[PDB]
Amino acid sequence: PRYYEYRHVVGFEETNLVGNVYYVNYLRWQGRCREMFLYEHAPEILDELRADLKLFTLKAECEFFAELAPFDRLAVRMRLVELTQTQMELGFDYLRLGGDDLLVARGRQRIACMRGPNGRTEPVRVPAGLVRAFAPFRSAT
Template structure:
């Protein structure tokens, strides 16, 4: 799952095929799966580019989604190939704002089906209170290495 650089920025790309399990009674992909896929894409980024963060999560770090949105353009159905492109819109010490574009892939052509966004914060329990903490250095380094930062929040 590579990072891809273009004239307008860079993005992390996650590819998969939808399943019947993800459909609703109408036969299209149930809307909640798009939100789940955002998390999966973010996790695959962590696995590939800053895997040491998993140990920090096991030691109490919490990457908490504080805002998430989806704007649907068309529908997906079972057994269609999907490409999700995740890019970082903005970042601060305690928050990352990411954009997601969902495409149906057919014969090497991409068709936009959904746009989304997500804001994530980094926290730990300190004296039984969730407290903001800086993102792990390896996450910051991964983002900076691929020059995803467009602005600071």
């Protein structure tokens, strides 16, 4: 279990006039996937994130290979690519679950942990709890 899975049934609001899913939604799903991971494996991070901790997204990207239709069942699999003192690089595989599974997109995010008054924040070491939650996903043993 080296990845976290977020499942989603595509809705009409996510489509555009061409009939497929508008590209922005793929980036939105990265955030949804990453926060559900926190909800299920490190809920304590919200209290921090509701306090003074901040998760700053340094980079967000997605490459698209195929299209998605309304009501396609999607599985976004998140993996930990790299964990540094203060940052985390996350990888996302987007699978359309059907008669057969199809990789419709692949993305990445780099996030930095930070604390301090808005405008006067500084990078902080990845919270111990989050590092523990990442245990099964870390390449390092």
